[PDB]
Design a protein around this nucleic acid. Sequence first.
DNA 1: GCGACACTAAAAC
DNA 2: AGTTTTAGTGTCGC
Length: 290
Amino acid sequence: VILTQLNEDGTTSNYFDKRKLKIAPRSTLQFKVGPPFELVRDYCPVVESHTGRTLDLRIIPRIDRGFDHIDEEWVGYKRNYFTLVSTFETANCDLDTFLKSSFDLLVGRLRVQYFAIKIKAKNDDDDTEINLVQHTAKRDKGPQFCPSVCPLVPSPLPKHQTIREASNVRNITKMKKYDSTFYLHRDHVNYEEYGVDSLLFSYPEDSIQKVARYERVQFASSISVKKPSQQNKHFSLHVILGAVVDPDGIPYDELALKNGSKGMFVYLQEMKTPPLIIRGRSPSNYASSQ
DNA sequence: GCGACACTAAAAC
DNA sequence: AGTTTTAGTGTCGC
């Protein structure tokens, strides 16, 4: 009824079928590691502005809620939240050095203002994009919003347990405990150590995330989860690492920039999940029907 | 089969 | 030790 896998940090992922077993909403059994991500491709090379050295990049993503491994399928529920977290790493550059340096895209060099992640959902069979929505903890008593582009600096990905523990923190003392894991406060560095041109000082805000945390995410309520044949549709979640550049022949999305102008989120790397099944609102998807 | 509202159980404090 | 918060899902009404 419950199938258990040991996670990397010694927590468990407990996979169960909600058609057969109902578990409380806030049970720790709702937290579990989702499908592993795979490389789609690498896109634009990035080089350090004097040495010319190519920056090695790797997305480090994980799903921490919302998906169960059931009968060799990865299964989510339309009505329920998923969590997708990601960092990136630069294998050949330590953070402290990285932040003082400057980087160009090799396309013909465009200067990188900052690095960022975005997520997308797709129909895995035809590449059609599927809208995602997020809520705040207040859910219907707060706003709905689409996942945003998240400026980030390189960081190790927190353990599954850490994401769990930080999921609903409001208490100031506990927030302080996790602050260094999730944020870099640029306003607290010694500005004299940095050149005007440094990467750190072209990030758009002083509070810079170390981890992209997309919590309380759902597929848009309009999604059709079955094909006309009544076979399940296959979806996939995508994580894209980009460099944001000033717009003034390679894959990119336009971005609403800080100064107001029409920025450019130039793709660097993309990963995706294997195929995902999503169960809809049908009563037959819930143990209550049995 | 959707948005809204309701109920409820364990986490958070 | 009690009260509030959060989120899976049951239900209503178009």
